[model samples]
Target: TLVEQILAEFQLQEEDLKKVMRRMQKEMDRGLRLETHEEASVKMLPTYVRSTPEGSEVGDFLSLDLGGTNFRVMLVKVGEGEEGQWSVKTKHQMYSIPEDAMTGTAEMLFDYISECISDFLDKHQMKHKKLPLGFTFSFPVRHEDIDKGILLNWTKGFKASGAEGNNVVGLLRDAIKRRGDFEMDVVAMVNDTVATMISCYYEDHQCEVGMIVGTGCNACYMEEMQNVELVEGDEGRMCVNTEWGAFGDSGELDEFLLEYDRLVDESSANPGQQLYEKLIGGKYMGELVRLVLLRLVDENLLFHGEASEQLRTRGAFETRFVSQVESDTGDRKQIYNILSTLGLRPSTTDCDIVRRACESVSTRAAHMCSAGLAGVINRMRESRSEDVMRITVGVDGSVYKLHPSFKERFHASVRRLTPSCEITFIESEEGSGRGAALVSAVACKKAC
Candidate 1:
C-alpha cells in the first residue's frame, strides 16, 4: 500500500508522458548550433612549431593530462635519432574528489594534482632538474596566446574558489615549485581537443578535425589564415583555435530545451553554452535518462502505481544501460535487471520503459551529433575550393567506441551533410599522451 501510494504521488497520464518523450526526441534532432565563425576552428598551436623535423634529436619530454576522470603522466622518448618514431611510457592514476572538495579552494585541488605528479615522478625515476612538461587541462580557458591559459570556469563538476580567473599553467607551476621535488618546466598548455588534433595530424597528413566525446563534447578543426577574424593583430598565420562549445546559445531549441534541458543547464556551472554536451556528455547522459523515466512514471505512461526508489539516486541510469538494451541478448531478462546491477529496483513495466528510454536517448544523441558534424561540413564548403576534399576527423572516448550505434549515426550525419567531401574518422594510435609529447618536441626545437 505504501509503495502504491508513492507511485501514485508521482504518476502521470500516458499521453503527457508520450508528449515529453516526443518533445525530447524532436529537440535532439534539431541539434545544438555552435557559433564559431564558419563553424570551423583550429587547435590554437603554432604551425611552424608543429612542422619541425621529427627525430630522436628532439630529445625526451614529459606530459601531464588532467582531464575529466584521471590524471595521466607520460614519458615520451624519441627513437634514437629516428624521425616521427617515438616511444612512450605512461602511468595513469585516478582519484575522485569528495563532494566537499568540489566546492573547496583552488589551492587544495592543484596541490593534490601536484602531489600526484610528484609521486608519479618518484615512482618512475623521472625526477629531472628541468624536465619539459606538456600540461593538458580540459576546461574552458581564455588561452592568452598559446602556452598560457586563463581559466574561464570549471566544468566536469569542479567548483573551486580562486581557480576561475587564474592562469592555469601558472597555478600548476607554482604548485610544482612549492613541492621542491622536481624542476618541471611547463613547455606547452593545451586543451584535450587540441591535443587530440595534434595526435591525429601526426598519423594522418590529411587529418583536420579533432573531436572528444567522453564525459564532455567539444571539437577542434584546422582553419585558414584569412578566415580567422580574431587573429588580425597576431603574426599572419594559417590556423587558429576556436572554442566550439560557446556555440550552443546561437540555436533555436524546442520546448523540451525550455523545460527539461534548461533545468539541467541552470544547475550546471556554465549554463547556455554546452547545451548539447549536457544532453550527450558522460556526466549528463545518465541524468538525461533518469529525467525521462521520472517524467514517464509521473505521467503513468509506463510504470503506473510502482515505486522506484533507485531512480532517486544519482547515475541510476547510464548510457551503458541503453547499450545493453540495444544488445538484447536473452541473457538479461527484465529491464530491472540493469537497475538491479546498479543497486535499483524494477517495476512491472521495467522492460518497456527501459527499451523506450534507450531508443529515445540514443536517437536524440545520434541526431544532435550529426547536426554538429553538418555545421562543420557547411563551413568547409565555404572556405575550400576543392571539389573533393579528403578530411580526417580524429575521434577518442568510450562513448563513440562502446555505444552500439553511435559511430554509425555520427558517420551517417556527416554523409548527409557532405556527400562530396571524403570524410574519414580515424582512431588515434597513441592518444593524447603522444600528442602532448609531439608538442613538447616542437616546443624544445623552438626554444633552441
Candidate 2:
C-alpha cells in the first residue's frame, strides 16, 4: 500500500496534464512577445531558416555537427531518386575533441576543428574543391542570418574561451584560412532541432516540427514571420528553436516539482536552470528514479531497509536501466539481473517495486514531453486559423528511440491533447549531419 501511494505521486491526472499544456502555451506566448520575451522562461530563439526543402536541391555539401566533445564531419551528395523524388547520400567521420580543446581558447578549438575537416577532405580526396558547408551548432545562439550566428553560451560541458560572443562561422572561416589546405563556403548555420526538421522535410513534405528527447529535451517549429517579433519579417515562416528545456526556470513547474525533482535540480551543474529538462531529459531521469528508490529504502520498503553502497551513490542507476527494467515480459528475470548488477539483491517484491518505479518515471517523462509538444501544435493551429491541421513531427534521440514504450505513450498523449490535428511522427536518421547539408543546399539555392 505504501508502494502504491508512492507511485501515485508520479501519476498525473488528465486535468493535471492539461494544466501543464496550458501553462506551456502561456509561457510560449510570453516568450514570443517583444516586451515579455526577455522575462519568459522559454527562450524561443529564431533559427533564421526561412524555408524547408523543395525536393529540387541538388549539390555536394559539407556538414559539421558540434554538439559535444565528439564532432562530426559529413560529406553529403544530393541527386534525383526514383519517380522524380530526391535522394541523399552521405559519408561521415567522427572526431573526438581532446579535453584541452573543449576547455581551451577559442582559436585552439577552432584550429582543431579545422584540422579534422582537412583530414576528412584528404581522406575523401576532395581537398581540391571548395564545398558549401553547413554547421550545426547545438547550443544557444542569436542569428543575424542563416550563415551568421553568435554563440550565446556553451552547454554540455563546453568552456572554450572567447567563443561565447563571437561569430561561429567567422571563427571557422578564420581557422580554415589559417590552415590553407582547403577552402569552404559556409552558407548555413542551424541548431540540431532545425536540422532534424529539414532532414525530415526532405523525406516528408508535411513535417514542420523537430524535437529531441535525448540527453536534453528541446523542440523547434516553423513560426509565422509576423509572430516572430524579434526578427524583421512578415511574409514567410521561420524555424524558432523553442529552447523549451528552460520552461520551468520562472517557477512555472512548481506544482509538478516533487522532492526528487527538486533534489535533481538543486544538485545539477546548472541548478535553477533547465528545470523542465531536468524532469524529463535522459541525463536526469535515472537520477530521479534513484532518489525515489533511495527514499523507498529509507522507509524500509525495499531491500530489507538496507541500501547497497552503489545504491547510495549518485548516478549509479543509469537511464538505460530504466528502459531495461520496464522492458521485462513479466518474468522478473530481467529485473533481477539488473538489480544484481547494481548491488541490489532484489526479492520478487523488490523487483516489482523497482519496475513500477521505472514505469512511473518514464511514463511521466513521456507525458510531460507530449504536453509541451501539444502546446506547440495547438499554437500552430491557432496561429494559422486552420479548421483542420495535418502536421508531422520529426523526432530523434535515445529516449524516444530506445525506450520501449516512450514513443507510443508520447504520441498518444500528444494526439489526445491535440484533438483537431492529424499528426504523424517520423524518426529522423542521421538528422544532424544530413539536415545540415540539406540546409546548406537550400541556402545556396536561394542565394544563386
Candidate 3:
C-alpha cells in the first residue's frame, strides 16, 4: 500500500520524461548562448588543458591529487621517454587531511600537504631536485590557463579559508615553498574531469569525453576553443569541464521536484546551490530517500508506527545502502541488516516499501543523468566533423561502474532521442593523478 501510494504520486510518464529531456537540452543551449544562468547549470569552465597525449612523452614527474578526503603525492615515471604507458613508483604518499585543515585557513592545511610532499621527496631521495608537478584541484575552479585556477566556491563539506576567490596554484606554490628545502614547480593544475579526459586520451587516443558519476557528477569533453563564446580570445580543440551539477535552479525543476527534494536542498550545507546535483548526484540519493522515509514514518505509514530515533539523524542513510537494497534479488537480507544497524525492525511490507522508495530515487537520478548525456551527445553531433569514428566516453566513479543496471537505464534514455549517434563508455581510473604526470610530460615535451 505504501509503495503504491508513493509510486502514484511520483509517476513520471513517458511524455513527462521526454519533456524533461528536452528541457535539459534547452538549458544546455541557453548556457552556450550566454542567456540565463539557471536551469541548465553548465559552467563551461575553461581548463586550458588539451587531450591527445603524445605517446613519446617521457619523464619523472610529481602529481598531487587534492580532490578527496586524503590528498595523494605520487611519483610517476611517464614511460621511459620514447614508449611507455603510465606507472606509479613506490615513492608515493597518502595523507588524510585533518578536520581542522579542511575547515581552516590555507596555511593551516596546505602547509601540511606541502610537508607531506617534502617527506615523500626525502623518502625518494629527490629532495633537492626541481621537478615539474601536475596538481589535480578537484573543486570547482575558474582558470584561463593550465597552471592557475581560481577557486569559485567550496563543495563536499569544505570551507577552507583563503581558498574561495583565490588561485589554487599560488596557494599550493606558497605552501610547498614553506618547506624551504625541497624544490618543485606546480606546472599544471587541472580538475578531475580534465585529468580523466587526458588520461583516457593518453591510453586510447579515441576517447572524447570524461565523466564522473560518483558522489558528484560532472563531465569534460573535447570542444574547439573557437566555439566557446563565454571565454574571450581562445582557439583550438581543448577539453571543457562542463560543471553540469549546477543545472535546474532557475525554476525549471520546480514542477518536478518532490517535497523531500526541497527539504534536502533547503537544508544542505550550501542551500540554494547545486540544486541539480542534489537531485541526481550520488551523495544526495540516500539522504533524499532518508528524508522520504522519515516523512512516511512520521505519518505512521512506514515501520508500522514503530519509531526510529536513528532515522531522525541527518545523513544516517547513505546512497550505497539504497543501491544495495535495490540490488537485492533475494530476500531483503541487506535491507534487514541495514534496518537492524539503524535500530529499526521492519515487516515484509515495510521492506517492500523501502525497496520501492530506493527505486524511485534511483530511477529519477538515472533518467535526469541520461537526459543530460543525451543533450551533450546531441550538441556534440552538431559540430562533429565526421561520422565514421566512434565517440568514446571515459567514465570514472563507483556509482556508474557498481550501481546495478544504471548504465542500462542511462543507455535506454540516450537512445530515446539520438538513436543515430554511436556512443561507448570505457571505465577509467586515477586519471587525475596519472594524467597530471602525462600532462607534465607533455608540457616538458613542448618545452623541448
Q: Model 1, poorest ten-residue lDDT window?
A: 40-49
User: Ten-residue segment with the worst summed lDDT in candidate 3?
Assistant: 81-90
For model 2, state the Cα shift of residue 93 in Å.
Answer: 1.7
Residue 155, model 1: lDDT of 68
Q: How far is candidate 2 from the true structure (C-alpha RMSD, Å)?
A: 2.4
lDDT measured at residue 334 in model 3 versus the true structure, 0 to 100: 79
- Candidate 1 ranges beyond 4 A from true positions: 1-57, 79-87, 90-92, 98-101, 232-240, 254-258, 342-349
Show how many residue pairs clash in every candidate, following the order shown.
Answer: 9, 0, 2
RMSD to the hidden true structure, all candidates? 6.9, 2.4, 2.8
Error in Å for residue 436 of model 2:
0.9
On lDDT, the candidate that comes out on top is: 2
Worst 10 residues of 2 by lDDT: 80-89
The residue pairs that clash in candidate 2, if any, are: none
TM-score, cand. 2 vs. native: 0.93
lDDT per residue for candidate 3 within 218-316, as digits (tens), equals: 777877666666656455677777777776767777788888888988778777777777877777888988987887777888897665788788889
Off by over 4 Å in 2: 52-57, 80-87, 446-448
Q: What TM-score, computed on C-alpha atoms, does each candidate reach?
A: 0.82, 0.93, 0.91
Tens digit of lDDT per residue, candidate 2, span 328-354?
Answer: 999999999988988878999999999
